[PDB]
């Protein structure tokens, strides 16, 4: 009955590969809008929005969320299209990519935004944002925000053991990592290699885990995605 929603995040008509972003805890794509606006080397940028944010609210298990997002991404994914994500969205993206491969669809690569495989070791606002940003206003409502917050609290209770990757992914992985983590977190990024059957590339980006997705750092993050993954 319920389905995730594939949402276009950037203006139509670009050249270059695509990206489908999986949502972090709370199920929204809002977090990727500024990034998408600054990318220049990509064609179509989409995000998957969780079911129930439009509708009956939905609180999926991690595996159910992966299923929802795979089914939505499968409409556009394949040759020339990356899967990507930040925070819990990186784990969903990894498992979504795995599921697409299992179904005979091969994304170009996996883009991980500043999260290690061990997720659990990371230590009014948007209403106002909507006044400044019709792209954000296109989603946000008082109702959408309440649903997002409830879904966020649910997804923040996902077990670290469940979201940990297990299998090796047979497409290239690009890990974009900030450089101000505590050493006990910094040391965990290399474990993406555990989950890579092929190439894995690490790229340092400016900012910190939160500020990398907003100005001024997001423009440099975008330039580095363009350089390393885009046209």
Number of domains: 1
CATH topology: Rossmann fold
CATH architecture: 3-Layer(aba) Sandwich
Task: State the secondary-structure class.
Answer: alpha/beta
The coarse silhouette is: globular
Radius of gyration: 16 Å
Per DSSP, the total helix count is 9
Distance between the termini: 38 Å
> What is the CATH C-level name?
Alpha Beta
Strand element count = 7
Would you write up a description of this structure?
The PDB classes it as hydrolase. Keywords: thioesterase, non-ribosomal peptide synthetase, nonribosomal peptide synthetase, depsipeptide. The assembly is monomeric. The structure is a monomer. By secondary structure, the protein is of the alpha/beta class. The protein has a single domain, classed as Alpha/Beta hydrolase fold, catalytic domain (Rossmann fold), CATH 3.40.50. Helices cover 35% and strands 14% of the residues. It has nine helices and seven strands. The chain has helices at residues 33-38, 62-73, 88-102, 125-132, 134-137, 142-155, 160-163, 183-186, 217-229, and strands at residues 5-8, 18-21, 45-49, 81-86, 110-113, 173-177, 200-204. Strands 1-3-2-4-5-6-7 form a seven-stranded mixed sheet, with helices on both faces. α2 (62-73) crosses α3. The chain is globular, with a radius of gyration of 16 Å.
Q: Summed up, what is this model?
A:
A 7-stranded mixed beta sheet has the order 1-3-2-4-5-6-7, sandwiched between helices. By secondary structure, the protein is α/β, with parallel strands linked by helices. 35% of the residues lie in helices and 14% in strands.
